């Protein structure tokens, strides 16, 4: 902040202040399990279940 002063008034000390901030790191996974038969049923009948 600025200040107003007379011709010999004492000038004050005033400074910016700073802080750091840090990210976190978040690891995400999705796993889906199915029987070998679901691959055969899907790719024979063209179900589109695996693509879904």
């Amino acid at each position: 902040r600025g200040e107003v002063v007379g011709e010999s008034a004492e000038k004050s000390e005033s400074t910016a202040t700073f802080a750091p901030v840090t990210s976190l790191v978040r690891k995400v996974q999705v796993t889906q399990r199915f029987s070998q038969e679901v691959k055969w049923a899907d790719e024979s009948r063209q179900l589109g279940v695996l693509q879904t």
Binding site: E37, W40, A41, S44, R45
Partner: protein
């Protein structure tokens, strides 16, 4: 006494290949032709009694 070969304990000679008893193959694969199929249970229609 005299030097016998039993003192050396010589290794036996391996002979190549394997001896096997035979195994019978599938009879159903010889007696019934395989039809083409798609994965899953088939269904067949049968006459049970005539008029």
């Amino acid at each position: 006494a005299v030097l016998k070969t039993s003192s050396f304990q010589l290794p036996r000679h391996l002979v190549p290949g394997v001896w096997q008893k035979a195994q019978g193959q599938s009879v159903l694969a010889r007696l019934s032709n395989a039809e083409p199929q798609e994965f899953g249970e088939q269904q067949y229609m049968t006459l049970t009694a005539p008029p």
